[PDB]
């Protein structure tokens, strides 16, 4: 039961890493991590940091990262969010005889920002609620 | 340049093909009269040129350059003389103008459309708009004191097993109830029938002191059945004149009917009314939008301030109170708020809302079949959420045309429509809407909506429709503006697909009961017997050799006798319409899987557990059980009417678990010794010339249904058809629980609902899945 996951935010992570945001990862299926990440979002709303929030999700958790990052949008009321959709390769070894299998899962990233996207959007068209 | 010239050549070929087929499909053999759409084709364009549009008439005149008696009577008097026999509704002539009208158990009604629209009716039923004509629903209006009508409904109710309608009082002020009533409280399982029930309590008393109304709406054969039940239960005591009422009712108006009597003892006033008011079922999501845009609330301002000359003084007497103006304003605001809602699909259960409507022939758009969606402005989200959460129309439920004298004064107006057609042409306006208002039709109408498949959890609220309730005078006048907007009309076949697609039984006669189901089954058996004697031999297959007693839909009366004899050895038509035991049966028949403990999920938020003695204890209190079942074909099947549901063996389980894509085994042939008997009867007949049995009828229904086939048959299907709601065969059929408990006790293992079926015309068995979602 040993898995290795390779991600194929590639050009987009540069201007974020120029400002060092808080990274969020949701692996497969976990309940109290939603409350923990909402607690860190409520804390980082008050802590001094730039308007840049990063969410990432792979596997079945590609539904859950849509849910919890919605909830912060009901509280923080963000303006510009980019949802990126890419391939992720999961090579996992398990036993029934040890066998390895390579699956292809979707990976969903959510980028919340206000001012970094104001010179942007000729092409990408993020939603502006 | 190899690849570049190849790219230019492929682009030129794509352009040539894309333009060529698009021009050629609109060309249609270079004929202008065939260029029109196929729904909009009239074959009388060769006789007179006016059947084509004017821009096309200017071409048709050049194409024509290139290429029985009158009515001698009063047609109203002929229609009255013919209406002396039949019913002849106001919109019946509109239906008979372009739909098939067939005589039935009551009046002659629409069976099928003249144009082939069987896929088009479903396509208009899903996304677009479609309406019906529902006038057969007879109404029992009951009046009385608050304590006596509750007793008269408690003698008939059976709340303890059925759905709550009378003593609940919280569902009554907002919405209606729709359920099945019963007979006298001996509880014999004999009489049953679906009845749509309406309460209304006024807002001002708030106490048992005034006169409480209640409404029963039902079916004409059910009217003949339940009118005697109410009578035994409660108490035993020169211009053109348009026949708006029924001539049977008009001729019985002097001796007996309509049945409006009182009671001195118990104070129950009974009003059986066959045709007093009409109802129209508009089904569709876009139907709500065009009903918002067409039906508009009348202005209370201009009439209420100073406009009063000559009669309709009742609107002045109503508008004299200051609360009526704000009430009509709130009704118009909530109507526009309902118009802001994107669909009639999100609404709890059959709500009721009535208001005053200025008649929809004021606008009358010039085009025909002009269907548009809403504008992109979809604001006011908070009030929509407030209406979806609570939805409390207590104040807006206004009963104005339900009275005895006011609705008759509405009907007494005797409005014309051809003259109103001419008044618009006398104004000579090209495209504007101008109707003068010294005297307008400021009358109220009711809207009772219907959610469909609320019980079934497969679609969760499929059939969203509205019900326009209106008086008998304002009939076809309110019909035709929707037709001009572009609403399609479906007949009894559209109600049949509304039943079978929503997996509900048909309310006239397709469910078995004693007075209605047996007579409807005999009436359908007469048509099938006429088609059977109409067809000669060597065309149809014999049912002796391959099948059994089919398709005559009454053999289960001796099938259930064999089942109860097999149960007891080792009251009739008892239908288990009790929702708790139906959920318990859904807990077994629905999920067919084993992972750790239970079906399809281990927690489930339910109570899983096997007890066979508790299942056998149900049959002790409920003899001769019969439950309807939604059955779904997995693959390779097209169901016919009257398919017999057969219990699978263990070898079928092994062969289906062995390989996927496996068809059912064939049925062995049976002995047919009756052919020599029919030949001897023919020889005796031709002997005596110089019990009519042709090819598979005989008087032997008892020993066969016990054990004839190689498999055990337990289930009979009324509506067997493929639905486009799933994309495969989806049938609905009546089974017995005494055969299903043996099926459930036979398999604690894997898939349990996989039960075979056999159509009568074929010898092939096809497996399907059983569901009971009530």
């Amino acid at each position: 039961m040993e898995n290795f996951r390779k991600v194929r935010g590639g050009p987009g992570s540069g201007p974020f890493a120029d400002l060092a945001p808080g990274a969020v990862h949701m692996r497969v299926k976990e309940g109290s991590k939603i409350r923990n990440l909402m607690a860190f979002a409520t804390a980082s709303m008050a802590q001094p940091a730039t308007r840049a929030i990063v969410f990432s999700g792979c596997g079945r958790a590609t539904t859950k990262t849509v849910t919890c990052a919605e909830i912060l949008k009901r509280r923080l009321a963000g303006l510009h969010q980019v949802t990126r959709l890419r391939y992720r390769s999961v090579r996992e070894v398990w036993q029934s005889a040890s066998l390895s299998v390579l699956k292809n899962v979707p990976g969903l990233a959510i980028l919340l920002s206000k001012d970094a996207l104001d010179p942007r959007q000729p092409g990408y068209q993020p939603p502006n609620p | 340049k190899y690849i570049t010239a190849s790219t230019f050549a492929q682009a030129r070929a794509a352009e040539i093909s894309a333009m060529l087929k698009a021009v050629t499909q609109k060309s249609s053999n270079s004929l202008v009269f065939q260029t029109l759409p196929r729904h909009m084709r009239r074959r009388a364009m060769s006789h007179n040129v006016k059947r084509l549009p004017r821009r096309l008439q200017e071409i048709a005149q050049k194409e024509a350059e290139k290429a029985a008696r009158r009515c001698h009577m009063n047609r109203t008097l002929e229609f009255n003389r013919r209406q002396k026999k039949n019913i002849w509704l106001e919109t019946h002539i509109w239906h008979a103008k372009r739909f098939h009208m067939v005589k039935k158990w009551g009046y002659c009604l629409g069976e099928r459309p003249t144009v082939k629209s069987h896929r088009a009716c479903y396509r208009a039923m899903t996304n677009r708009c479609l309406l019906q004509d529902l006038s057969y629903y007879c109404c029992l209006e009951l009046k009385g004191k608050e304590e006596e009508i509750l007793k008269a409904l408690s003698g008939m109710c059976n709340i303890d097993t059925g759905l709550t309608f009378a003593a609940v009082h919280c569902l009554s002020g907002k919405r209606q109830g729709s359920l099945v009533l019963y007979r006298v409280n001996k509880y014999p399982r004999e009489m049953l029938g679906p009845v749509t029930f309406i309460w209304k309590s006024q807002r001002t008393p708030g106490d048992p002191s005034e006169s409480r109304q209640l409404w029963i709406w039902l079916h004409p054969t059910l009217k003949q059945d339940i009118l005697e039940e109410i009578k035994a239960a409660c108490q035993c005591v020169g211009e053109n004149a348009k026949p708006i009422k029924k001539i049977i009712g008009d001729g019985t108006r002097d001796p007996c009917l309509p049945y409006s009597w009182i009671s001195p003892t118990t104070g129950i006033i009974i009003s059986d009314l066959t045709m007093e008011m009409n109802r129209f079922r508009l089904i569709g999501p876009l139907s709500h939008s065009i009903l918002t845009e067409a039906i508009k609330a009348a202005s209370v301002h201009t009439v209420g301030e100073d406009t009063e000359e000559t009669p309709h003084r009742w609107w002045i007497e109503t508008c004299k109170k200051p609360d009526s103006v704000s009430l009509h304003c709130r009704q118009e605001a909530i109507f526009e708020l309902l118009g802001g809602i994107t669909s009639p699909a999100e609404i709890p259960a059959g709500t009721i809302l009535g208001l005053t409507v200025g008649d929809p022939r004021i606008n009358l758009p010039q085009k025909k079949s002009k269907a548009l969606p809403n504008p992109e402005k979809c604001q006011d989200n908070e009030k929509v959420r407030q209406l979806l959460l609570e939805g409390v129309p207590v104040e807006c439920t206004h009963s104005f045309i339900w009275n005895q004298d006011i609705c008759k004064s509405v009907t007494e107006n005797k409005i014309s429509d051809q003259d109103l057609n001419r008044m618009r042409s006398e104004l000579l306006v090209p495209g504007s809407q101008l109707i003068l208002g010294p005297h307008e039709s400021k009358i109220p109408i009711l809207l009772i909506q219907q959610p469909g498949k609320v019980t079934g959890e497969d679609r969760l609220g499929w059939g969203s429709g509205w019900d326009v309730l209106l008086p008998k005078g304002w009939g076809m006048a309110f019909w035709i503006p929707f037709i001009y907007r572009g609403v399609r009309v479906g007949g009894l076949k559209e109600s049949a697909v509304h039943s079978q697609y929503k997996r509900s039984p048909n309310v006239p006669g397709d469910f078995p009961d004693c007075p209605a189901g047996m007579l409807f089954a005999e009436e359908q058996a007469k048509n099938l017997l006429e088609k059977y004697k109409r067809r000669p031999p060597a065309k149809r297959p014999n049912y002796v050799k391959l099948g059994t007693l089919a398709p005559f839909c009454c053999p289960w009366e001796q099938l259930t006798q064999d089942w109860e004899s097999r149960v007891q050895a080792y009251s009739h038509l008892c239908v288990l319409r009790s929702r708790k035991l139906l959920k318990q049966l859904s807990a077994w028949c629905g999920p067919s899987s084993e992972d750790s403990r239970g079906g399809r999920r281990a927690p489930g938020r339910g109570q899983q557990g096997l007890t066979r003695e508790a299942c056998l204890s149900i049959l002790g209190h409920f003899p001769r059980a019969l439950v309807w079942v939604s059955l779904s074909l997995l693959s390779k099947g097209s169901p016919e009417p009257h398919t017999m549901i057969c219990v699978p063996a263990k070898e079928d389980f092994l062969q289906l678990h062995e390989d996927w894509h496996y068809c059912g085994p064939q049925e062995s042939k049976h002995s047919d010794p009756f052919r020599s008997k029919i030949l001897k009867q023919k020889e005796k007949k031709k002997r005596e010339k110089r019990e009519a049995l042709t090819l598979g009828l005989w008087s032997g229904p008892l020993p066969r249904v016990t054990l004839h086939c190689s498999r055990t048959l337990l289930g009979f299907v009324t509506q067997g058809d493929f639905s486009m709601a799933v994309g495969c065969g989806e049938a609905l059929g009546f089974v017995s629980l005494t055969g299903l408990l043996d099926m459930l006790s036979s398999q604690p293992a894997a898939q349990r609902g996989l039960v075979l079926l056999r159509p009568p015309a074929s010898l092939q068995y096809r497996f399907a899945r059983i569901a009971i979602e009530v």
């Binding site: - | 570049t4 010239a5 190849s6 050549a9 794509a14 352009e15 093909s17 894309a18 060529l20």
Partner: protein, 147 residues
């Protein structure tokens, strides 16, 4: 009062676009008749003298749409692979290949040709990676969207 016609599409697959430029209706008709006369006798080839005829031809594209009867399209489509050794002004080796057999119905045959052309455009794009052809591809997509 009518006869159910059948139609067939065939792509000429070859390099050296002088072979792409060397097409004619009479030459192709005589070629198909001569190569059926080698395979089939009088009964096979003479039925192609009345039923078979050239219908649609493109020089650069190489897609040929041909007619054929109800009782003879099996014989014609079985005679199609044996079209070998076209001798001409140069030493060429052209060869036909069937895309899909359409049962008459010219309109959906032209519909299937458009999707086949779109598949022939879009798949060739990623393997080449050249902007000089990509500009003409963008112009073709723009002109198709104008339609």
């Amino acid at each position: 009062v009518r006869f159910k016609h059948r139609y067939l599409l065939c792509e000429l697959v070859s390099d050296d676009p002088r072979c792409r430029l060397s097409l004619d209706d009479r030459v192709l008709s005589s070629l198909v008749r001569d190569t059926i006369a080698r395979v089939h006798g009088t009964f096979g080839a003479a039925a192609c003298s009345i039923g078979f005829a050239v219908r649609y031809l493109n020089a650069y594209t190489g897609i040929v749409l041909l007619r054929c009867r109800k009782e003879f399209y099996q014989l014609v489509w079985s005679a199609l692979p044996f079209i070998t050794y076209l001798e001409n002004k140069g030493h060429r080796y052209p060869c036909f290949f069937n895309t899909l057999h359409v049962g008459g119905t010219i309109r959906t045959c032209q519909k299937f040709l458009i999707q086949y052309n779109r598949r022939q455009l879009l798949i060739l794009l990623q393997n080449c990676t050249d902007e000089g052809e990509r500009e003409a591809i963008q112009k073709s997509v723009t002109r198709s969207c104008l339609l």
